[PDB]
Amino acid sequence: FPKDFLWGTATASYQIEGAAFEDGKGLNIWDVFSHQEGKIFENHNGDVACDHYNRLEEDLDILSKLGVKSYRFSVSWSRVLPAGIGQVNHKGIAFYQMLISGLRERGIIPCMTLYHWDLPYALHLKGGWLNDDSPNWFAEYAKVIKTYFGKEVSYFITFNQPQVFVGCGYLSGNHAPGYQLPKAEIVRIAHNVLKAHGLAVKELRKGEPCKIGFTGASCPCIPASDRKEDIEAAYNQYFSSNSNEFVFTDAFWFDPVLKGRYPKWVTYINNVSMPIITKEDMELISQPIDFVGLNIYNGKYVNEDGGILQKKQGVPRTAIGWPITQEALYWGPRFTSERYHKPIMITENGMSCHDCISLDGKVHDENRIDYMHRYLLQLKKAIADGVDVEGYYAWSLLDNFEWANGYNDRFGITYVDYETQQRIIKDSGFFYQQIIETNGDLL
Amino acid sequence: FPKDFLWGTATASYQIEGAAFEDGKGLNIWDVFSHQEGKIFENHNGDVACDHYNRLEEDLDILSKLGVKSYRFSVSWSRVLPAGIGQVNHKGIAFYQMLISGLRERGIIPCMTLYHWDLPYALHLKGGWLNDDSPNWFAEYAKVIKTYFGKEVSYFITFNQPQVFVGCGYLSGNHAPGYQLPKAEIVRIAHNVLKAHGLAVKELRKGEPCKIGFTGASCPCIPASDRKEDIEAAYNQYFSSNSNEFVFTDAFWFDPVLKGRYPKWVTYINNVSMPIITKEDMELISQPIDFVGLNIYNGKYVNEDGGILQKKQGVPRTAIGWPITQEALYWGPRFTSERYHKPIMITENGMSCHDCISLDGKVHDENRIDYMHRYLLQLKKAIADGVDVEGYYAWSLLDNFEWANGYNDRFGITYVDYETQQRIIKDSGFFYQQIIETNGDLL
Amino acid sequence: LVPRGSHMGFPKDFLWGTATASYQIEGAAFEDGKGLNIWDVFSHQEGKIFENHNGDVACDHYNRLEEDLDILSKLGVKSYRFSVSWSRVLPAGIGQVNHKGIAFYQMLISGLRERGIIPCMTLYHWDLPYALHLKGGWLNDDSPNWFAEYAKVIKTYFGKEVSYFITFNQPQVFVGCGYLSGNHAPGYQLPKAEIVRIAHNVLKAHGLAVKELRKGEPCKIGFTGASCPCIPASDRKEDIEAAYNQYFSSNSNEFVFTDAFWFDPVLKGRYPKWVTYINNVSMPIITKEDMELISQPIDFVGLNIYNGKYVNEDGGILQKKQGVPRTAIGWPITQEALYWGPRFTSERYHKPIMITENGMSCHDCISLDGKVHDENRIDYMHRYLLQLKKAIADGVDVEGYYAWSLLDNFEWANGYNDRFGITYVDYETQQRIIKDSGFFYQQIIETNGDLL
Amino acid sequence: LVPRGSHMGFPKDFLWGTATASYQIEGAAFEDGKGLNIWDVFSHQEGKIFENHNGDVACDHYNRLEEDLDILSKLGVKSYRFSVSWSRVLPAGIGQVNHKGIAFYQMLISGLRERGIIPCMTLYHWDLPYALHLKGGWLNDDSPNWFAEYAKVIKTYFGKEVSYFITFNQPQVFVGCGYLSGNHAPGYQLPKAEIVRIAHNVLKAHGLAVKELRKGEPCKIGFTGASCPCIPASDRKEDIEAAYNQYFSSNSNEFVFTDAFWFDPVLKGRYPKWVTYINNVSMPIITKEDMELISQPIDFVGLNIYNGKYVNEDGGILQKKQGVPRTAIGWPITQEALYWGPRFTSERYHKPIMITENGMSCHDCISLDGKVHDENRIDYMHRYLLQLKKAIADGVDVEGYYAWSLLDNFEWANGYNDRFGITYVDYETQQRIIKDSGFFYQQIIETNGDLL
């Protein structure tokens, strides 16, 4: 691993902060969605979550104790702009200022996600990402971000996982705001998000220099073998998309951002209400960017011909049900490097485990250690084969609100007892600490 | 029946007009919704419908031939304001001008519905009835209506059946735009629609004098007997509503419009994102109105205690599946008269039949004749017992696009062969003609 | 097909009929020692039937036999198609005969003979005795022997007076809806291999039943299929061939509702080709002796036709026309179905055809004038019979036509929400009112369809 | 209950066991004349099982008997609980015994005796012979006689060497999931009256099986229930009473998954009161002779306990705590269930209890070090056994505890996605790796639980 390699841990505003209805914070779509009967596992919500808004100091101390180089967090748009535009809320700004000072004080590099799915409710009432002005709303947010944090923060990510907040939010309907919209409206929302990204980059370039990223949800295709043919088939499957399956793919989002073009098929869709995609739109979307964010939890194995192989019977898996596929943190970085020739940051990687406090009062998560050890060995091999990887962020610092699954999935290197809000560092946290101290030399 | 009694027939823009993408007409939510896979019976849509935009003269001639006193139609908001606000489309205005001249020329009183569910798509993209400004959008529409039609049209209905376009549009999701929103969002939309109504009334009062109505979907409770006790129980059931069942009720919509108050329970709901309902809102909503529109197709029988009785085994029914309950056109008018002390117009009454062209080349609909005869006898009895009823509009002039059921339900007194667009007046049309000629004396 | 001549019209001996089924009309479900059937239990299960309707009472025809026979006489009907309740005559489905049950059908058959009406007896119209269901129903190896025992009791007690038998009504529906889709009793959704097992047991049951019905008095025996005829795009030889091929097609993923899957075994002594190649877990062993038992000689093919589907030049199903004339149950009106169905079935099997059911669900009510006006049913009947007449003209041997139904009745999972009757039934009073269609049909019978 | 005091701990003769079931481990589904069972057919139906998994091969334990017996020896297990495949020893479920089938279980039982391991034989762990399903399965009046014939064959061929029998494993699940919810074979959703009929036929089957198992060698006979114990809000007499009452409650709308519905008939010779008042169509006739047959004397009550539910002072079920410790199958970890379940069952029936199943699904894998580390399973086992120990201390007679399971295996509708084993199985190679939990359990057995 490089000497400057960003050894990180990651969170998101709604998943940890709590204090949902305090200090003039505006409603977001997850406040409303999570309160709707039957949207969340056992009607869990992020009203309180890890109460991190009120326990900032303790969590910064855990970050210091683990020896984490970088902290990836999201800003609550609705906390800093309660109506999403206009009046800034300084109590909101103050929280993130106090966070960023805490980080600088401890020599931890801030990595700021602008959008981790908590759209201000006031903007949702105006049609959210269906609204022609939604890119301008986001630009205004991005300008406020640079204004108040541009001095101290030099790492920005515009959007976390558009695949999920657009796919699950507006196509499948299992995430806020919980819609199932026609293809034309999905493409309209995707285009408004990508243009929002363009305007946000422009805003973030005004003043202090910084590194700006775009984070994709990625399920890398793992080749059947090292044979050139099998590798090519995996590459092709990985970057494929069509009118009936695009919103969850890499190419549909990354080609516009990095190559300034949508996949071929997008030009041929003539559905009623399809948005007008102009050359100026594509030039706005494809602003120069410093790194590609990859959120990789697992991949899929493909045959010689790039067909997806049946998951092996009894494949090692996680508490959320996903398979453990170590090679995903090799092939995902590699193929993304080959396609876009950009520095890669693993902005999320981690595992849901059925964690508990043992009789000895500790949290033993050997499955998470093995997952982390296996995946980091593969990331190491990718760096060895010439993939430029600038860092790796463990999802997550804390067990937290896992969206439609509520608190039923624990991704943390730190356990949270929700009765007391007690943090207990898991074996995985101490294991990760050793990796950072040794810059991954002993994996 | 009174000498001035408005013997009418009714239509709606999207159900008959066609010409969906012509003469600068803007998209509406039904253009987009009806083109979504699986939203409509056999993917029917109103692209062409009865092609009434292009066959206006023939349909006016059928109106004349039947001897209809009044014609109830809706204006396509998206035809006269393609983006829903700003630029008026005069080709759109011209169509309705030509309709209204055709009506005046034939001595037929125009009854103009402003909103029959075809929300401009541009406003939907801005959040539709969730948007704070949606009442102002509607006011702007209502002002354009009065401006261009206030001279010739003296009968206006702001909203047709908010129960259905809000309930089916945004709660059950079977109507455009096809959402299933939490209670708080339904109340927000209801409040925005009722305020829209207030602003629209104010707009329609500026200039020529006119009669303005509000039309409710009504399923009247029919008492077990003429006993005072049973009648009281039916009245109470009819005007009941609660937090878990309100959007399809009469009182939830009519109390705000006519009494300037929501039902008691509404004040006590504190759900996340609930709108703030102010005394000024309630005063805006409760503008003075000239008649109550009732769309009555059937009612429900209630026991002595106002509990809804199981439908009788083999109850006479219609091709859409609804029961035939003749007394509904007595008790609905009567209870609405008793509660609000306002003139009533039956703005819709009619029956879906499995109509076809017989071997003799005619359309025989005796079931529709019997339905109409039975229901009008009950309306006559209501007038006799002192209910002020100013008119009755047969739904519909033409077989048409019956929303999520497409063309599978025929409500017309005129048959439409969709292969040729040929109109054939049904036996019911000639029966209705005789009723109008005889002012219902021979029922 | 060789034309017969257009002049002749309907034959002079043509069986002008009306049809019913036991569970749909009889009521008296728990009386005179009658055993439970699968529809008694299924219809009492929450949410199985429209508004939890059941056939406990139905048209109370068990108790109003005389009035209904008088309506049959008044209409001048040549033949009456009815089903025997297996569970009424054999309450446990085998062993002890119930003579109170036998007595009812004796009294019916005497009433018919007395009025010069030819009885047409359906043995099985879906009301499997519950005692046999508890023994696995049509999954049981012995189910064909249970049915044989039933068919023997039928011939024993009714063979003297009844000379027209139908073993099974619409196996497509009682097997497809009963055991694949699960919307009919007993309401199962079984794998393909179990559907084939049940189909095979039903077809063997049919074989044994034919053998039983041949012992003693001579009779005409039929097998009734649910048929949705493919209507060709045009009269072009190519389009007709494509429709014929689509109509008689079947495969492992779509067979239970087809004609060929049921009729090839009965009439040709073979299943479609694909059946021999299926090796699914639990597949039944289909032997040459099974196929010979199934293919007993039969006198007519019963067709229950309500509508068909229009197919393109290549036999692909065409989109239904926008606003196509339809019925109260939602089905389209497709008059040519009662031409092409009889014709293709005649061409394939070279057998006499009886239209064992044809009719229309209408939203019927008692008008202010106290009558039931069903012009839509008249037009449906007139249009369909014109097409049947044309089929006879083009050389299809058609021995009769049974209007579904004599009475409005219990329409299975739809309960009393669908009225198929030429006679209206008010379920509050059990009053019968003959509809306009009944008087229209009377005129057709009187004139042997000469004026259609 | 009279206390023993905490010092003594587990009895000296305490049966430290591990458990399996035939279909979940054996494989060899279509070999050595083995008949089809309902799980062979159900698991081959599209979409019935997670990723269309099936038990065709499972852990291939039929072919790897010796290796698994060696793991049993190495762990030092006192008792092995396994099920006999009915369809392996009687391919048509009755009549012709299959000696190749008998031979397998003979070789198993010899392997066990040879290693000083006490066999605990489950007759029925859900694999109903398919031939009997075709005859209506547990709906058939004769189903108890089919089971008696099976139980007679069991005693005949294994009565010499096996002195521990369990008639039925978890009727709650094979009846509830098999015939009410429909997520288990045969996958039906039957009315209440059919569920009661099946329950009654199963309980009578149990009666006849006990009678059969008493003929010849002396033996201990059990009945195993699926139990979700109610855990009281506190130690207050009133909160404990409310939990006891909730735990043993049942009514017409919620009975099939309860303890009392199954155990009252078996142990007290009566159904809950409400059963006598149900008059649903097709309800079976429950006679005093039926109840006397069902309530044959038995030696122990089997409890399969994985977790319980927390109840308030009034016995109402409390909302599960936010982030409650849970397992890979999604169930909560509720340690006190293995106290309160044994205790309340002891108080109600005054019978010896065996924990016939207890264990945890974990997301287990082979670590980089080539071992399987399952500390969550160790903690689960340690916590639950501490609670069982406390129950023994407070005077509950507990004769043994069987860890579910010896091997990771086919977890029914979840396929191989849930690993319950103290031994890991790589399904690609069929390699067994003993997990940390296996070595932890070995130490507990060696020390008779003295160090818990």
Q: Are A50 and A398 in contact (CB under 8 A)?
A: yes
Q: Do strands A422-425 and A414-417 pair parallel, antiparallel, or not at all (unpaired)?
A: antiparallel
Helix (H, G, I), strand (E, B) or coil at B93: helix
Residues of B with Cβ-Cβ distance to A129 under 8 angstroms: none
Taking the C-alpha atoms of residue A367 and residue D367, their distance in angstroms, rounded to an integer, is: 8
Residue A30 corresponds to which tokens in the numbers above?
């997850």
Q: Is D367 on the interface with A (CB under 8 A)?
A: yes
Quick one: A360 exposed, middle or buried, by C-beta within 10 A (0-12, 13-18, 19+)? exposed
Strands C423-426 and C431-434: antiparallel
DSSP line for B54-83: S-HHHHHHHHHHHT-SEEEEE--HHHHSTT
Q: Which of D325, D332, D413, D328 is nearest to D374 (CA)?
A: D328
Smallest Cα–Cα separation from B351: which of B311, B298, B292, B294?
A: B298
CB pairs under 8 A between A and B: 57
d(CA D235, CA D237): 6
**Å between D132 CA and nearest CA of chain C:** 9
Mutation for C interface: D36, D39, D45, most C CBs within 10 A: D45
C8 by Cβ neighbours in 10 Å (0-12 / 13-18 / 19+) ranks as exposed
In-domain check, residue B443: no
Burial A91-129 (b: 16+ CB within 10 A, else e): ebbebbeebbebbeeeebbbbbbbbbbbbbbbbbbbbbb
- To which H or E segment does residue A282 belong? helix A279-285
Cα distance between residue C20 and residue C25, in whole Å: 7
**CB of B113 closer than 8 Å to CB of B170:** no
Cα B62 to Cα B78: distance, rounded to the nearest angstrom:
27
B351 → chain C, closest CA residue = C363
The total of other beta-carbon atoms located within 10 Å of residue A271's CB is 15
Write out chain A residues lying below 8 Å of D310, CB-based.
none
A354 touches chain D (CB under 8 A): yes
D1, part of any domain: no
Q: Tell me how far apart the alpha carbons of residues D420 and D426 are, in angstroms, rounded to a whole number.
A: 13
User: If you compute the radius of gyration of chain C from its CA atoms, what whole number of angstroms results?
Assistant: 21
Which residue(s) pair with D220 in the sheet?
Answer: D164
Q: Is D33:D98 a contact under the CB 8 Å cutoff?
A: yes
Could you tell me if A339 and A294 are in contact, meaning their C-beta atoms sit under 8 angstroms apart?
no
Neighbour tally for B360: CB within 10 Å: 10
Inter-chain contacts counted by CB atoms under 8 A, chains C and D: 58
Residue B227 in tokens: 């006993």
List the single residue in B with minimal CA-CA distance to C365: B316
d(CA C1, nearest CA chain D) in Å: 44
In angstroms, the CA C261 to CA C228 distance is 14
Three-class SS state of C157:
helix
CA distance B398 to B414: 5
Pairing of strands B109-115, B70-74: parallel
- Breaks in chain B at C–N > 2.5 Å: after which residues? none
Secondary structure element (H or E) that encloses residue B222, with its range: strand B221-222
Task: Assess if residue D204 is contained within a domain.
Answer: yes
Structure letter (DSSP) for residue C180: I
**CB A350 within 8 Å of CB A356:** no
Secondary element (H or E) of residue A16: helix A13-16
Residues in a beta bridge with A9: A71, A394
Full residue range of the structural domain in which residue A242 is found: 6-437
Are the C-beta atoms of residues C361 and C380 closer than 8 Å to each other? Answer: no
Contact at CB, C363 and B366, closer than 8 angstroms: no
The full DSSP string for C78-144 is SEEEEE--HHHHSTTSSSS--HHHHHHHHHHHHHHHHTTPEEEEEEESS--BHHHHTTTGGGSTTHH
Residue A316 at interface with chain B, using a CB cutoff of 8 Å: no
Question: Residue B362, CB half-sphere, CA atoms under 13 Å: how many?
Answer: 10
Tokens of C403: 């209007």
What region does D246 belong to: left with phi over 0, alpha with psi -120 to 50, or beta? alpha
Residues of D in contact with C45 (CB under 8 A): 191
Supply φ then ψ for residue C233, to 5 degrees: -60, -30
Task: Spell out the SS3 assignment of A289-331.
Answer: CCEEEEECCCCEEECCCCCECCCCCCCCECCCCCECCCCHHHH
Do B and D make contact via 3 or more CB pairs under 8 A? The reply is no
CA distances from B265 to A60, B130, B187 (A): 46, 21, 12
Pick B314's closest partner by Cβ from C320, C373, C416: C416
- Cβ neighbour number for residue C316 with a 10 Å cutoff: 10
Q: According to DSSP H, which parts of B239-365 are helical?
A: 251-254, 265-268, 279-285, 328-340
CA distance A11 to A74: 7
Strands D423-426 and D431-434: antiparallel
Round to whole Å and give the CA distance between C86 and C130.
10
Q: Which residues does residue D222 pair with via DSSP β-bridges, in sequence order?
A: D166, D300
The answer to whether residue A56 neighbours chain B at the CB level (below 8 Å) is no
Contact across the interface for D427 and A313, Cβ inside 8 Å = yes
Where does chain C break, by residue before each gap (C–N > 2.5 Å)?
none
Contact B317 C363 (CB under 8 A): yes
Asked whether C430 and C66 are in contact (CB, 8 A), the reply is no
How far is D189 from chain C, CA to nearest CA, in Å? 8
* Residue B308 touches partner C, C-beta closer than 8 Å: no
Give the span between the Cα atoms of A308 and A329, in whole angstroms. Answer: 18
Residues of chain D in contact with residue A410, where contact means CB-CB under 8 angstroms, are 323
CB contact (8 A) between residue C136 and residue D141: no
Interface check C284 vs D, CB under 8 A: no
Alpha helices in B298-395 (DSSP H): 328-340, 366-384
What residues form DSSP beta bridges with A374? none
Mention every residue, 6+ apart, whose C-beta is less than 8 A from residue D112.
D69, D72, D80, D118, D119
Backbone angles phi, psi at A302, to 5 degrees: -115, 150
Interface test with D, best of A322, A324, A356 (most D CBs within 10 A): A356
From chain B residues 389-408, the ones with a CB under 8 A of any chain C CB are 399, 406-408
Name the residue of chain B whose CA is nearest to C53's CA: B313
φ, ψ of residue B425 in degrees (nearest 5): -65, 130
Q: What whole-number distance in Å separates Cα of residue D301 and Cα of residue D344?
A: 12
D373 lies within 8 A of chain A by CB? yes
Longest dimension (CA), chain D: 63
CA distance D256 to D168: 15
For chain D, the chains sharing at least 3 beta-carbon pairs closer than 8 angstroms are A, C
A419-423: long-range contacts (C-beta < 8 A, 24 or more apart)? A419/D321, A419/D322, A421/A50, A421/A51, A421/A55, A423/A55, A423/A58, A423/A59, A423/A62, A423/A398
Strand partners, D317: D311
Contacts of B391 (CB under 8 A, 6+ apart): B5, B6, B7, B8, B69, B70, B345, B346
Is C314 among the domain residues? yes
Token pair of C295 as six digits: 């293919």
In chain A the first and final C-alpha atoms are separated, in Å, by: 11
Residues B95 and B23: their CA atoms lie apart, in Å, by 10
ω before A172 within 30° of 0 (cis)?
Answer: no
- C-beta of residue C23 within 8 angstroms of C-beta of residue C34: no
Q: Is the peptide bond between B263 and the residue preceding it cis, with omega within 30 degrees of 0?
A: no
- Distance from the Cα of C445 to chain D's closest Cα (Å) equals 43
Instruction: Say what the resolution is, in angstroms.
Output: 2.1
Please count the structural domains in chain D.
1
Collapse the DSSP code of C250 into the 3-class scheme (helix H, G, I; strand E, B; otherwise coil) and give the result: coil
Tell which residue, A318, A329, A272, A283, has the closest CA to residue A428: A318
* Cβ neighbours around A280 below 10 Å, total: 8
Closest CA relative to residue C140, chosen from C95, C85, C205? C205
CA distance C105 to C100: 9
Among candidates C98, C142, C143, C104, which has minimal Cα distance to C124? Answer: C143
Q: What distance in Å separates the CA atoms of residue B221 and residue C30, rounded to the nearest whole number?
A: 37
Distance CA C255, CA D5 (A): 70
Which chains would you list as touching C if contact means 3+ CB atom pairs under 8 Å?
A: B, D
List helix spans (H) across A321-365: 328-340
C413, two tokens:
């999972």
Tell me the residue type at C185: A
Within A192-309, strands assigned E span: 211-217, 221-222, 291-295, 300-301
Residue of C nearest to B371 (CA): C367
Contact criterion met (CB below 8 Å) for C267 and D31: no
- Chain B positions touching C375 (Cβ under 8 A) are 358, 364, 366
Quote the strand ranges of B315-432, DSSP E.
344-349, 389-395, 414-417, 422-425
What does DSSP assign to residue A361? S
Breaks in chain A, after residue numbers (C to N greater than 2.5 Å): none
Q: What angle do CA B434, B439, B440 make, to 5 degrees?
A: 75
In chain B, which residues have their Cβ closer than 8 Å to the Cβ of A130?
124-127
CA-nearest of A179, D352, C228, C353 to B130 is: A179
Q: Does C281 touch chain D (CB under 8 A)?
A: yes
B197: domain CATH number is 3.20.20.80
On whether residue B37 sits in a domain, the answer given is yes
Q: Considering only CA atoms, which of C179, C196, C197 is closest in space to residue C188?
A: C179
Q: What is the DSSP letter of C318?
A: P
Per-residue three-class SS string for chain D:
CCCCCCCCCCCCCCEEEEECCHHHHCCCCCCCCCCCEHHHHHCCCCCCCHHHCCCCCCCCCCCCHHHHHHHHHHHCCCEEEEECCHHHHCCCCCCCCCHHHHHHHHHHHHHHHHCCCEEEEEEECCCCEHHHHCCCHHHCCCHHHHHHHHHHHHHHHHCCCCCEEEEEECHHHHHHHHHHHCCCCCCCCCCHHHHHHHHHHHHHHHHHHHHHHHCCCCCEEEEEEECCCEECCCCCHHHHHHHHHHHCCCECCECCCCCHHHHHHHHHCCCCCHHHHCCCCCCCCCCHHHHHHHCCCCCEEEEECCCCEEECCCCCECCCCCCCCECCCCCECCCCHHHHHHHHHHHHHCCCEEEEEECCCECCCCCCCCCCCCHHHHHHHHHHHHHHHHHHHCCCCEEEEEEECCECCCCHHHHHHCECCCEEEECCCCEEEECHHHHHHHHHHHCCCCCC
Torsions phi, psi for A74 (to 5 deg): -110, 150
Nearest-by-Cβ selection for B358 from C362, C375, C417: C375
Is A170 within 8 Å of chain B by CB?
Answer: no
Give the whole-angstrom CA distance, residue D86 versus residue D35. Answer: 9
Alpha-carbon span C243 to C247, nearest angstrom: 6
| Residue of A354, A399, A408 lying closest to D363 (CB–CB) | A354
Residue type, D247: Y
Phi first, then psi, for residue A58 (nearest 5°) are -60, -40
CB contact under 8 A, B353 and C375: no
H helix or E strand, kind and range, residue B155 = strand B155-160
Instruction: Please name the helix (run of DSSP H) or strand (run of DSSP E) that holds residue B196, with its range, or none.
Output: helix B183-205
The single residue listed with the structure tokens 């699904």 is: D361
A214–D contact, CB cutoff 8 A: no
Number of H helices, E strands in chain A: 15, 12
Touch test B–C: 3 Cβ pairs or more under 8 Å: yes
Quickly list H helices, B6-55: 13-16, 29-33
Q: Does B35 touch chain A (CB under 8 A)?
A: yes
Closest Cβ opposite residue A127 in set B27, B127, B272: B127
CA distance B172 to chain C (A): 21
Experimental technique used?
Answer: X-ray
Min CA distance, D391 vs chain A (Å)? 19
Residue C451 resides in a domain: no
Residue of C nearest to B369 (CA): C367
> Domain for residue B310, yes or no?
yes
Tokens 């006193």 found at? B69
DSSP single-letter state for residue C60: -
Q: Which residues contact B202 (CB under 8 A, 6 or more apart)?
A: B139, B287
C-alpha pair distances (Å), B321 with each of A342, B218, B283, B316, D332: 62, 17, 40, 10, 47
Q: Please identify which residue in the block is written with the tokens 């019911």.
A: B428
Q: Return the residue in C282, C283, C285 with the most chain D beta carbons within 10 A, the one to mutate for interface testing.
A: C282
- Please indicate whether, in this complex, the C-beta atoms of A27 and B128 are within 8 angstroms of each other: no
Taken in order D145, D147, D151, D156, the sign of the CA dihedral is positive
The answer to whether D414 faces chain A, any CB pair under 8 Å, is no
From the list C323, C367, C382, the residue facing B410 with the nearest CB is: C323
Alpha-carbon gap, residue C105 to C126, rounded angstroms: 18
Taking a C-beta distance cutoff of 8 angstroms, is the pair B354, C363 a contact? yes
Q: What number of residues does chain A have?
A: 443
The DSSP secondary-structure symbol of A109 reads E
Report the alpha-carbon distance of residue C175 to residue C187 in Å, rounded.
Answer: 10
Q: How far away is chain D from the Cα of A341, in angstroms, using its nearest Cα?
A: 32
Q: Is C187 left (phi over 0), alpha (psi -120 to 50) or beta?
A: left
Q: Tokens 């077809």 appear where?
A: C203
Task: Give the span between the Cα atoms of C381 and C375, in whole angstroms.
Answer: 10
**Cα–Cα separations (whole angstroms), residue B22 to B6, B19, B26, B92:** 33, 5, 9, 9
Q: Say which residue the tokens 């019935």 belong to.
A: D48
Q: How many residues does chain D have?
A: 452
Domain assignment present for D5: no
The alpha carbon dihedral of A248, A251, A256, A261 has a sign of negative
Enumerate the residues of chain C whose CB falls inside 8 A of the CB of residue B354: 325-328, 362-363, 376
Dihedral of the alpha carbons of C1, C4, C9, C10, in degrees to the nearest 10: -70
